């Protein structure tokens, strides 16, 4: 790839992960080498080699990968090499990468390599974009933040112990063991405010302990608040569905709605939540851009609506408007979509489920079963109002989902398109002025002549 | 074939009956694996319970082969399709792995290793499904979510107790202060004491409380740090879940209070009189006390037309049929009119209408009592109880009315009255599809007014030009057709 | 007399019955677990218990005398109230509360106050009083904090009593975990007993620990259960306090969300910096002066009658002071008030300039409006609150020389809040008032004159109907002539 | 001169008076409880207290000089400002805060600085400064957490002073719970005293414990109450941080909920994978470039005047660049700006196609458009930013052969943000501008080249006369046709 997309390239996500690992190595090992005596001259070459590897990763980030990132200017992607280079040089990420790449044997001289934190944020954004259910990764990231805070606390505790002498007091690290897990144990008992540690004696120890308990109270509060936000955001939809269901049940219980109707309402609520994951789709549709909603309506129902012979020859924008005006209604099993003799107003598109047309002697006979993608009742749309009645009983075999367009919405669409409105009136008149007056005049002339001729004879 | 409906009560009962062996496994497998005395002392009971658990696991797989799923709104009853649907799912692999006969490894490792039954833990999905179905089925979701969280934390604490006992066994009992003490002790050698001290240590570590012997060895330090971090995660999860539940339970109160204080801020901002402010505050106290803060339009907005129509019919159909004009109306028209009813609630002393006010809506008394009063309002002519109505003639708009959609009486709410108004525009919107019923309604209103003695442009302009233009094309076409006969007549001679 | 549950007397009685309920809920378990507390002040305990039982009896009498809203009216019939009370579970709970268990003092002894634990069943009055206080007081957060603190104090006190009773059952001083031996001069004092038990309970229930570690298995079990209960209690405290904190800054958070969205839009659109500064200043003015909530959305929460009453109270006098609307019907004035839309202008803003379209009439609720010239530095007249302009523009009067144009420049000197009545709103309100519309137009015409300003188609349709019929006569005659001509040719053939 | 409360000078004075208030609220109780702190630096304390009292007097003067909004205008009358100050409770609080209680230094000695505890009554002024800071700062969350930290430190400091005072009343070193004997050189250091007291207070007020257990009954009671207060404090800290975390992530949570909802809708509807990918890319582009919010929902919270001014500032120049709106009245252009509706399009999206009904005028704001040849592979011309099309179709011009239909296929090359002006909105704006409507029609006619009831009734009269002439001719033609057959017969 000559040009790499910063958003949808998995190899760029892998390179970002490599840069994040280099930045994490720097951030997690600078205070270790500053505080702990682990940076001995015997094993200094491992540190130098891995620091050189991290600096090489930083260099091939700032010079190679970042300059090939395509960007947006006025909504258009730019693939040009010079334009991408100018965009990256203008951006503040180049400023931070230049600040980090500056070298400035002391581990604290490696400090501004921690200023390449932007790559970590872009890696977080890519991870939250690629995978659904991202609050588990948010929990992992917050736990990693807590681990790094305890890491810094461990390094600070070892520095304080070395400053006051190892084993001089009970509060400082005594000097036995791994020497990192003892200070990390101190950081865990301190920054979580668990306690149980030897009490500080000197003024420096009490000040350190005090500040570390204050930072630990606030860090534990950050942990709990992050987990609370994760729990609230993860269960927000379920909470809203339960609240709406409980409000409906409370409403039906206040008005003494019988158990059959309440059970049907609860069944619809559970089926809708388990099927489409939301109680209403138009609430989501109005939040989208108009072009997005139009294109989604097209992708859902355009072929099915254009397969209907009634609307053939109409304007395409009028078809689009009916697609936008379609409302999704879920019918329970054994529910009457169309009862025999009622006013027909609605055009039904079976998105899912089956619909049975009843008939025969004494009812209860399936004349025909309509599966998904079939449209019935479209003739009722072209009626003057009260002029259409359902001929046969129409029932839902199971949980069928019908995309429904009523006559009123069709009329408000049709007032905008005169040619298609005229075509629809023509089709309605064809399926069932000058010629009427000519026939009336011819009949009247013959009727008057018959009476005149009879009186003449 | 007999197919179990996943939405039915039988499926929930079997979910409980499979959760019991799953919970038994998830606790006692690790309990017996880590505490050797627990496995050895009650070996026959554990063998019987494990056999029963395996039997129930087999019946669970059989139920899974018989469990229908909604395909295109229909429950699938084809046994081959159900079996294929089960097998294609990962749950079939998990159930096969969970019933692998690892109990035959007792003959290779002895009875002291019940870790072979750790594969039985893979039936956790049945437990989770049963608990989520219980959450969706119970009438106390918050109490049950407390219970579910508490028992999950108890299970994790028991697991950490078993892990701590195993680590103390591996390091050595009584080797240092951190591990479990020497099991040759008469007090600390008891199995109950072993489990309860392990549980005490695990609770104190997983609740980030401490107050336990500090670690001595580096491995003990690593385990203590890791288990305290697991406890940090557990504590944050507990507090976050309970805080989210508290926010959910207080959300309705918070929204109602936000509305109340917003209206209070508006009333202070517009300098509304103190009596009117007190009336508003009394109204909101009545709303929250009687649990009437819900809005019918907002509550029923998600429901489809059929179900909302059914609920509204079960509320209003008898009373709307009791109305004289709507007594003979069609069932579909009655459904539409019932659906177009809007709730109105009036405080005691409120006036629903006054003499000379414009009458555009017809009121239905659902709950409460109304009074017809004079101009002063002290006297009452008649008291209208629930199920009564007034203003049915005003919405009809009968031509020749003396009132002219104007109220002729003063209606006062004696107490808190729940009324349902049917506006004139809603009535014509319902009557658009019922022209014959509309004509019948006008005739009925005319008859009532006669019994009461209360009865005594551009479209055509464009139509004339349009008809003339259409007739001119026909006349031109008729002349052209007649010209062919005239041309043929000339050619005939 | 029947006590209104929504009145102040009912609230005062709720407090008066909550006091014995709290006394029971604390001191009954305090005396049951601490024997010396019961025995040392026995006469005081007996007097307080008799007083509490008397108040419980008066509470039952009040329950028989408390009205309920049936058909929106308070029920004042004694038999109906008695039946409503005895039908509820509260009657059974109150009867069980006042069971004369005190006769068991003669059987078990004076050191067994657990027989008065049935008095705890009157918790309904305590909880109802706390809910009524939460919905009543002007300081909801302070009272909610106080109530939560009292709940935690009661729970910690109960846990302290439980710990002391467990120490008593095991034996004082038998090991390090229990309360020490009560023959000690220091720890044998009742005050020391209670304060140490309360200290232990506060240590264990607030996830702190630092108690003497358990020795016996029962002590380990109780410590595990009690630490889990304390974790739940602490999580409940945090959840309630966090919910309260979220509710306090919910308005600030949502206002900051609106400001941040506006800033995002202004940075998006490259809006000029002065305009952004004015927007920021306007939002700061809204927040500082408590004008953040918009009037329309706030008034949507109120019912139609209450919203109409609020609007009348705010705008009726200043609408009646308008000269065109001075002599108008009350219903039309109410509709026009309901049709008013607020508009707020920053200082230096222009309400309207010369040549602008005048389609609305502004009412100055508060603020000062200046009539300025083209330069804007010279002021003709200052319009104070209650003044109005543009009343002629909203009346569609024929022959007006100044048609829908503003003849003056109106500038807002300060933060003026105005209400506008558009021409469309006035027309819609006047649809139902034709005579009022006619006299409004006549009055506007009179004002303009005083101020120096200002069925043939149907008959032709009948001719057009005759024209079409006559035009079709020749078409039928042409068909008759064509048939005769074709037959003549056929006969000649 | 009168100080505007919303001005920057009022904020600067709020800071300048909050510093003495914070100084009093901490160090007065610090000196009251730690006698060594008051005795060692008495000269410094006296100087700072006199300075604080002087700043309190200047604060009273500022409150006399601080205006308020009456009838939307700042009150600049000295008498009304003085009466408004004196009528409020704050004047009484300031007077009680500035009683010369320092005369009790001559009676009770120099080791009783609690006589200055009345100076704490300017807490409302300090809280007002913090409110102004949280409503003014560009980092609301950073200031919120620092303000919470400052309040917690103040409460912890007060409890530390209370603990030291309780230890002093019981006796230093009388038992293990109290502060140890101050006659010891290590425990007698003032820095050591305050630091250990603060350490004890922070431990006790944050549910940490780690303190020597109480010995006396009063110590047990104080520790229990203090533990209850600390539970409240730590729960408050957790709730504040959780509310802050929810507030930062609220917009991201709303956007992610929209992502989950649209993804669930597309999986439920069996939406094609190309359309799903296009929707996801569109949403990601909207979020990363800060565009995902609806413009109507964002701008509806502004007042009508500010919304009109912002819309004018955004759209007036690009609407005046239109050839049909080049010479128009200012009010008509302002209204047409107000009727503009934003539209956004993905790459490859068709704004309009050939044969579509044209009712909207699109103006490109931050996008790029092209005209394709019914196949999408070739482009006649590329429409850059500020360009427009459909200005003729929105005008009702008589005799237009290609009217009411789109003659060109407009395709969005990339992510284009357009503003559409519908024909209905243009006509609605033109109702109040008849002469501008006639000018627009005349201009559209010129571009395309390169009484009613009485008139309609009279028009039918000419048609009736013309029909009579045709009928009279047909009657004469019928007789000639019959006479023609008579000659043959």
PDB file of N, CA and C in Angstrom, chain B residues 55-108:
ATOM      1  N   UNK B  55     -26.334 -36.578  34.880  1.00  0.00           N
ATOM      2  CA  UNK B  55     -27.639 -36.957  34.340  1.00  0.00           C
ATOM      3  C   UNK B  55     -28.424 -35.716  33.926  1.00  0.00           C
ATOM      4  N   UNK B  56     -28.433 -34.695  34.787  1.00  0.00           N
ATOM      5  CA  UNK B  56     -29.154 -33.466  34.472  1.00  0.00           C
ATOM      6  C   UNK B  56     -28.492 -32.731  33.307  1.00  0.00           C
ATOM      7  N   UNK B  57     -27.170 -32.848  33.160  1.00  0.00           N
ATOM      8  CA  UNK B  57     -26.493 -32.287  31.991  1.00  0.00           C
ATOM      9  C   UNK B  57     -26.931 -32.986  30.706  1.00  0.00           C
ATOM     10  N   UNK B  58     -27.064 -34.315  30.751  1.00  0.00           N
ATOM     11  CA  UNK B  58     -27.579 -35.056  29.600  1.00  0.00           C
ATOM     12  C   UNK B  58     -28.999 -34.625  29.254  1.00  0.00           C
ATOM     13  N   UNK B  59     -29.854 -34.478  30.269  1.00  0.00           N
ATOM     14  CA  UNK B  59     -31.221 -34.028  30.016  1.00  0.00           C
ATOM     15  C   UNK B  59     -31.224 -32.594  29.497  1.00  0.00           C
ATOM     16  N   UNK B  60     -30.258 -31.777  29.921  1.00  0.00           N
ATOM     17  CA  UNK B  60     -30.134 -30.422  29.393  1.00  0.00           C
ATOM     18  C   UNK B  60     -29.788 -30.433  27.912  1.00  0.00           C
ATOM     19  N   UNK B  61     -28.874 -31.313  27.498  1.00  0.00           N
ATOM     20  CA  UNK B  61     -28.577 -31.429  26.071  1.00  0.00           C
ATOM     21  C   UNK B  61     -29.788 -31.931  25.292  1.00  0.00           C
ATOM     22  N   UNK B  62     -30.536 -32.875  25.869  1.00  0.00           N
ATOM     23  CA  UNK B  62     -31.751 -33.359  25.217  1.00  0.00           C
ATOM     24  C   UNK B  62     -32.783 -32.244  25.066  1.00  0.00           C
ATOM     25  N   UNK B  63     -32.926 -31.403  26.092  1.00  0.00           N
ATOM     26  CA  UNK B  63     -33.825 -30.254  26.021  1.00  0.00           C
ATOM     27  C   UNK B  63     -33.346 -29.267  24.963  1.00  0.00           C
ATOM     28  N   UNK B  64     -32.029 -29.054  24.884  1.00  0.00           N
ATOM     29  CA  UNK B  64     -31.468 -28.164  23.871  1.00  0.00           C
ATOM     30  C   UNK B  64     -31.775 -28.663  22.465  1.00  0.00           C
ATOM     31  N   UNK B  65     -31.760 -29.983  22.265  1.00  0.00           N
ATOM     32  CA  UNK B  65     -32.184 -30.527  20.979  1.00  0.00           C
ATOM     33  C   UNK B  65     -33.680 -30.353  20.741  1.00  0.00           C
ATOM     34  N   UNK B  66     -34.469 -30.169  21.799  1.00  0.00           N
ATOM     35  CA  UNK B  66     -35.914 -30.016  21.691  1.00  0.00           C
ATOM     36  C   UNK B  66     -36.371 -28.579  21.907  1.00  0.00           C
ATOM     37  N   UNK B  67     -35.444 -27.632  22.011  1.00  0.00           N
ATOM     38  CA  UNK B  67     -35.786 -26.242  22.282  1.00  0.00           C
ATOM     39  C   UNK B  67     -36.007 -25.509  20.966  1.00  0.00           C
ATOM     40  N   UNK B  68     -37.220 -24.996  20.771  1.00  0.00           N
ATOM     41  CA  UNK B  68     -37.525 -24.274  19.558  1.00  0.00           C
ATOM     42  C   UNK B  68     -36.972 -22.864  19.560  1.00  0.00           C
ATOM     43  N   UNK B  69     -36.850 -22.310  18.359  1.00  0.00           N
ATOM     44  CA  UNK B  69     -36.401 -20.942  18.168  1.00  0.00           C
ATOM     45  C   UNK B  69     -37.306 -20.255  17.159  1.00  0.00           C
ATOM     46  N   UNK B  70     -37.464 -18.945  17.323  1.00  0.00           N
ATOM     47  CA  UNK B  70     -38.348 -18.168  16.464  1.00  0.00           C
ATOM     48  C   UNK B  70     -37.648 -17.903  15.139  1.00  0.00           C
ATOM     49  N   UNK B  71     -38.085 -18.588  14.088  1.00  0.00           N
ATOM     50  CA  UNK B  71     -37.608 -18.344  12.734  1.00  0.00           C
ATOM     51  C   UNK B  71     -38.757 -17.767  11.922  1.00  0.00           C
ATOM     52  N   UNK B  72     -38.599 -16.512  11.487  1.00  0.00           N
ATOM     53  CA  UNK B  72     -39.640 -15.765  10.778  1.00  0.00           C
ATOM     54  C   UNK B  72     -40.933 -15.712  11.590  1.00  0.00           C
ATOM     55  N   UNK B  73     -40.798 -15.502  12.896  1.00  0.00           N
ATOM     56  CA  UNK B  73     -41.944 -15.361  13.768  1.00  0.00           C
ATOM     57  C   UNK B  73     -42.637 -16.649  14.147  1.00  0.00           C
ATOM     58  N   UNK B  74     -42.112 -17.796  13.732  1.00  0.00           N
ATOM     59  CA  UNK B  74     -42.697 -19.090  14.044  1.00  0.00           C
ATOM     60  C   UNK B  74     -41.733 -19.901  14.895  1.00  0.00           C
ATOM     61  N   UNK B  75     -42.277 -20.616  15.873  1.00  0.00           N
ATOM     62  CA  UNK B  75     -41.474 -21.559  16.640  1.00  0.00           C
ATOM     63  C   UNK B  75     -41.183 -22.785  15.786  1.00  0.00           C
ATOM     64  N   UNK B  76     -39.901 -23.096  15.607  1.00  0.00           N
ATOM     65  CA  UNK B  76     -39.514 -24.248  14.802  1.00  0.00           C
ATOM     66  C   UNK B  76     -39.794 -25.526  15.580  1.00  0.00           C
ATOM     67  N   UNK B  77     -40.518 -26.450  14.954  1.00  0.00           N
ATOM     68  CA  UNK B  77     -40.836 -27.733  15.561  1.00  0.00           C
ATOM     69  C   UNK B  77     -40.212 -28.911  14.826  1.00  0.00           C
ATOM     70  N   UNK B  78     -39.482 -28.670  13.741  1.00  0.00           N
ATOM     71  CA  UNK B  78     -38.805 -29.749  13.033  1.00  0.00           C
ATOM     72  C   UNK B  78     -37.606 -30.213  13.848  1.00  0.00           C
ATOM     73  N   UNK B  79     -37.573 -31.507  14.184  1.00  0.00           N
ATOM     74  CA  UNK B  79     -36.539 -32.007  15.086  1.00  0.00           C
ATOM     75  C   UNK B  79     -35.160 -31.973  14.437  1.00  0.00           C
ATOM     76  N   UNK B  80     -35.078 -32.256  13.134  1.00  0.00           N
ATOM     77  CA  UNK B  80     -33.789 -32.193  12.451  1.00  0.00           C
ATOM     78  C   UNK B  80     -33.266 -30.764  12.395  1.00  0.00           C
ATOM     79  N   UNK B  81     -34.151 -29.800  12.130  1.00  0.00           N
ATOM     80  CA  UNK B  81     -33.736 -28.402  12.098  1.00  0.00           C
ATOM     81  C   UNK B  81     -33.314 -27.920  13.480  1.00  0.00           C
ATOM     82  N   UNK B  82     -34.031 -28.344  14.526  1.00  0.00           N
ATOM     83  CA  UNK B  82     -33.649 -27.984  15.890  1.00  0.00           C
ATOM     84  C   UNK B  82     -32.299 -28.586  16.266  1.00  0.00           C
ATOM     85  N   UNK B  83     -32.070 -29.846  15.890  1.00  0.00           N
ATOM     86  CA  UNK B  83     -30.800 -30.506  16.184  1.00  0.00           C
ATOM     87  C   UNK B  83     -29.657 -29.822  15.443  1.00  0.00           C
ATOM     88  N   UNK B  84     -29.877 -29.468  14.173  1.00  0.00           N
ATOM     89  CA  UNK B  84     -28.851 -28.767  13.406  1.00  0.00           C
ATOM     90  C   UNK B  84     -28.567 -27.385  13.985  1.00  0.00           C
ATOM     91  N   UNK B  85     -29.612 -26.681  14.429  1.00  0.00           N
ATOM     92  CA  UNK B  85     -29.425 -25.369  15.040  1.00  0.00           C
ATOM     93  C   UNK B  85     -28.632 -25.477  16.334  1.00  0.00           C
ATOM     94  N   UNK B  86     -28.918 -26.506  17.136  1.00  0.00           N
ATOM     95  CA  UNK B  86     -28.146 -26.736  18.352  1.00  0.00           C
ATOM     96  C   UNK B  86     -26.694 -27.078  18.035  1.00  0.00           C
ATOM     97  N   UNK B  87     -26.468 -27.940  17.041  1.00  0.00           N
ATOM     98  CA  UNK B  87     -25.117 -28.407  16.748  1.00  0.00           C
ATOM     99  C   UNK B  87     -24.254 -27.301  16.152  1.00  0.00           C
ATOM    100  N   UNK B  88     -24.841 -26.439  15.317  1.00  0.00           N
ATOM    101  CA  UNK B  88     -24.080 -25.340  14.734  1.00  0.00           C
ATOM    102  C   UNK B  88     -23.655 -24.310  15.773  1.00  0.00           C
ATOM    103  N   UNK B  89     -24.361 -24.225  16.896  1.00  0.00           N
ATOM    104  CA  UNK B  89     -24.009 -23.289  17.950  1.00  0.00           C
ATOM    105  C   UNK B  89     -22.807 -23.797  18.739  1.00  0.00           C
ATOM    106  N   UNK B  90     -22.055 -22.853  19.315  1.00  0.00           N
ATOM    107  CA  UNK B  90     -20.932 -23.191  20.181  1.00  0.00           C
ATOM    108  C   UNK B  90     -21.385 -23.888  21.458  1.00  0.00           C
ATOM    109  N   UNK B  91     -22.655 -23.716  21.837  1.00  0.00           N
ATOM    110  CA  UNK B  91     -23.175 -24.349  23.042  1.00  0.00           C
ATOM    111  C   UNK B  91     -23.120 -25.867  22.953  1.00  0.00           C
ATOM    112  N   UNK B  92     -23.274 -26.430  21.752  1.00  0.00           N
ATOM    113  CA  UNK B  92     -23.145 -27.876  21.598  1.00  0.00           C
ATOM    114  C   UNK B  92     -21.727 -28.337  21.906  1.00  0.00           C
ATOM    115  N   UNK B  93     -20.726 -27.595  21.425  1.00  0.00           N
ATOM    116  CA  UNK B  93     -19.339 -27.924  21.734  1.00  0.00           C
ATOM    117  C   UNK B  93     -19.063 -27.785  23.225  1.00  0.00           C
ATOM    118  N   UNK B  94     -19.604 -26.736  23.852  1.00  0.00           N
ATOM    119  CA  UNK B  94     -19.412 -26.551  25.288  1.00  0.00           C
ATOM    120  C   UNK B  94     -20.077 -27.664  26.089  1.00  0.00           C
ATOM    121  N   UNK B  95     -21.258 -28.110  25.658  1.00  0.00           N
ATOM    122  CA  UNK B  95     -21.951 -29.188  26.355  1.00  0.00           C
ATOM    123  C   UNK B  95     -21.235 -30.519  26.173  1.00  0.00           C
ATOM    124  N   UNK B  96     -20.669 -30.755  24.986  1.00  0.00           N
ATOM    125  CA  UNK B  96     -19.883 -31.965  24.766  1.00  0.00           C
ATOM    126  C   UNK B  96     -18.628 -31.952  25.629  1.00  0.00           C
ATOM    127  N   UNK B  97     -17.927 -30.815  25.672  1.00  0.00           N
ATOM    128  CA  UNK B  97     -16.734 -30.699  26.505  1.00  0.00           C
ATOM    129  C   UNK B  97     -17.065 -30.803  27.988  1.00  0.00           C
ATOM    130  N   UNK B  98     -18.250 -30.344  28.393  1.00  0.00           N
ATOM    131  CA  UNK B  98     -18.637 -30.376  29.795  1.00  0.00           C
ATOM    132  C   UNK B  98     -19.057 -31.762  30.260  1.00  0.00           C
ATOM    133  N   UNK B  99     -19.408 -32.655  29.336  1.00  0.00           N
ATOM    134  CA  UNK B  99     -19.774 -34.024  29.670  1.00  0.00           C
ATOM    135  C   UNK B  99     -18.742 -35.033  29.186  1.00  0.00           C
ATOM    136  N   UNK B 100     -17.511 -34.590  28.954  1.00  0.00           N
ATOM    137  CA  UNK B 100     -16.430 -35.521  28.619  1.00  0.00           C
ATOM    138  C   UNK B 100     -16.182 -36.431  29.816  1.00  0.00           C
ATOM    139  N   UNK B 101     -16.127 -37.753  29.637  1.00  0.00           N
ATOM    140  CA  UNK B 101     -15.974 -38.643  30.797  1.00  0.00           C
ATOM    141  C   UNK B 101     -14.589 -38.562  31.416  1.00  0.00           C
ATOM    142  N   UNK B 102     -14.305 -37.448  32.091  1.00  0.00           N
ATOM    143  CA  UNK B 102     -13.053 -37.287  32.816  1.00  0.00           C
ATOM    144  C   UNK B 102     -13.055 -38.014  34.152  1.00  0.00           C
ATOM    145  N   UNK B 103     -14.210 -38.518  34.594  1.00  0.00           N
ATOM    146  CA  UNK B 103     -14.278 -39.269  35.841  1.00  0.00           C
ATOM    147  C   UNK B 103     -13.530 -40.592  35.760  1.00  0.00           C
ATOM    148  N   UNK B 104     -13.235 -41.074  34.550  1.00  0.00           N
ATOM    149  CA  UNK B 104     -12.395 -42.252  34.383  1.00  0.00           C
ATOM    150  C   UNK B 104     -10.940 -41.989  34.741  1.00  0.00           C
ATOM    151  N   UNK B 105     -10.539 -40.724  34.872  1.00  0.00           N
ATOM    152  CA  UNK B 105      -9.200 -40.389  35.335  1.00  0.00           C
ATOM    153  C   UNK B 105      -9.040 -40.556  36.839  1.00  0.00           C
ATOM    154  N   UNK B 106     -10.127 -40.843  37.562  1.00  0.00           N
ATOM    155  CA  UNK B 106     -10.005 -41.236  38.962  1.00  0.00           C
ATOM    156  C   UNK B 106      -9.221 -42.532  39.101  1.00  0.00           C
ATOM    157  N   UNK B 107      -9.321 -43.418  38.108  1.00  0.00           N
ATOM    158  CA  UNK B 107      -8.575 -44.671  38.126  1.00  0.00           C
ATOM    159  C   UNK B 107      -7.099 -44.469  37.808  1.00  0.00           C
ATOM    160  N   UNK B 108      -6.723 -43.308  37.273  1.00  0.00           N
ATOM    161  CA  UNK B 108      -5.332 -43.016  36.948  1.00  0.00           C
ATOM    162  C   UNK B 108      -4.668 -42.068  37.935  1.00  0.00           C
TER     163      UNK B 108
END
